[PDB]
Amino acid sequence: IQRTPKIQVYSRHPAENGKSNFLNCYVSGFHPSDIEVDLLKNGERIEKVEHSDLSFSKDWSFYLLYYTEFTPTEKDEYACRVNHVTLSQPKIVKWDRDM
Amino acid sequence: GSHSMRYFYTSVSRPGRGEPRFIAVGYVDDTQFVRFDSDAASQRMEPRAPWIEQEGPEYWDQETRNVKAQSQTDRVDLGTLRGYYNQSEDGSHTIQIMYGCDVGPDGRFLRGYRQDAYDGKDYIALNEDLRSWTAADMAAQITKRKWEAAHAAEQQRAYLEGRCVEWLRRYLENGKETLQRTDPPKTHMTHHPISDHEATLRCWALGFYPAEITLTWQRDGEDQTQDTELVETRPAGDGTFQKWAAVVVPSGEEQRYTCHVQHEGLPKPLTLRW
Amino acid sequence: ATIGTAMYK
């Protein structure tokens, strides 16, 4: 049995246009651990993305945080793009500053 | 006033692509404090919290030796289990191990844990008595007989009631300014029209520690769960957590609704109204 | 601090 990731995309701090922040993509509930997470700016890959150390929950499913420094603006669109063996194609989740 | 220490190990085979990946992480409560990764350059256990950086080189040397020895056990065990199950050498498989201890407010031992999975399902677990094992299937019964012969439960119990508790107490004292402090949630409400007829109210809790929290919605004083949504608690990236709860309401009726926030760091529960 | 024993299966 394989488990598909849950995905949340959000900022460290409430977004303020022109103020430096961190863009986060939190993936959880997945198995097995191999997973591909990119963060996108206007559809293009963000070059520098770091991630937390792999850990797991009581049901043995894994969780990871992927993150980049960013400065939000009114017009730039951010997103996370996740691939996993459970996904028939990559899943793109858009950043909404109100979620 | 109760506290926990946990270690989480993961080994993943990579047939055709070298030796297995091994990752170890340690936590006190909701705070990660150490890590090891087979694929990192250092080949050393590394600090992840400020209060562990004070430990001396003998501490880092010993922790490194221990996790390297477990990584080599896991490599061998991935082969052993493959053979018990008659699995192909072409497949990637996973071993996961959790262990650690809980202490009460007086520092006394509450209980210990050691549990193991294979491919994300229970394989073998140390029972709460720390004196016997539960095997999940016939392959794990082989391992159980091996561990019974080896007195493995006594080894585990000696650590869990001894070293584990003594070091958790040490970390709680050295790290007290953060581990024993609560950060209450910073709370606010947002409002998001859907149409002229409906709107979303979203109640936010940000920057809190520890992770446990309750957010609830009320309509005219009564708990409402219809037409609500609660997101899973998520890390902020800085050691704190975030959560929100939302309700869809009829436009004009927003001020009927309240959100209540409960957290250990709050002198009193918070109420929010739009 | 981690356990020192590693248990083979």
Author numbering:
A (entry chain B): 1 to 99
B (entry chain A): 1 to 274
C (entry chain C): 1 to 9
Article passage:
Human leukocyte antigen class-I (HLA-I) molecules are responsible for presenting endogenous peptides mainly generated by proteolytic machinery on the surfaces of cytotoxic CD8+ T lymphocytes. In particular, peptide binds to pocket-B and pocket-F with the help of anchor residues P2 and PΩ, respectively. We employed a well characterized HLA-A*11:01-EBV restricted peptide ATIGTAMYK derived from BRLF1 protein product Rta (134–142)28 to investigate the stability of HLA-A*11:01 molecule in complex with shorter peptides (<8-mer). To elucidate the structural basis for the two short peptides occupying the same peptide binding groove, the crystal structure of HLA-A*11:01 in complex with two short peptides, namely ATIGT (5-mer) and AMYK (4-mer) was determined at 1.66 Å, and was compared with the structure of HLA-A*11:01 in complex with the 9-mer full-length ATIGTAMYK peptide resolved at 1.35 Å.
The 9-mer peptide is seated in a more extended conformation and is held in peptide binding groove in a canonical fashion by primary anchor residues, namely P2-Thr (P2 anchor residue) and P9-Lys (PΩ anchor residue). For HLA-A*11:01-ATIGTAMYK complex, residues P1-Ala (solvent exposure: 0.4 Å2), P2-Thr (0.0 Å2), P3-Ile (9.3 Å2), P7-Met (0.6 Å2) and P9-Lys (8.1 Å2) show the lowest degree of solvent exposure and are therefore, buried deep in the peptide binding groove. Whereas, residues P4-Gly (49.3 Å2), P5-Thr (33.4 Å2) and P8-Tyr (59.3 Å2) display the highest degree of solvent exposure and are oriented toward the exterior of the binding groove. The side chain of P2-Thr of 9-mer forms direct hydrogen bond with Glu63 and Asn66, as well as through its main chain amino group it is directly hydrogen bonded to Glu63. Additionally, the main chain carbonyl group of P2-Thr is stably held by forming a direct hydrogen bond with Arg163. The F-pocket of peptide binding groove of HLA-A*11:01 is characterized by negatively charged backdrop made up of Asp74, Asp77 and Asp116 residues, and which is suitable to accommodate positively charged residues, lysine or arginine. This is evident from a salt-bridge contact between the side chain Nζ-ammonium group of P9-Lys and Asp116. Additionally, main chain amino group of P9-Lys makes a direct hydrogen bond with Asp77 and carboxylate of P9-Lys forms direct hydrogen bond with Tyr84 and Thr143, and also interacts with Asp77 and Thr80 via water molecules. The data for each pHLA complex was recorded with two different protein batches, resulting in an average melting temperature (Tm) of 33 °C for HLA-A*11:01-ATIGT + AMYK and 70 °C for HLA-A*11:01-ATIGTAMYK. The higher Tm-values for 9-mer peptide clearly demonstrate the preference for canonical mode of peptide binding to HLA molecules.
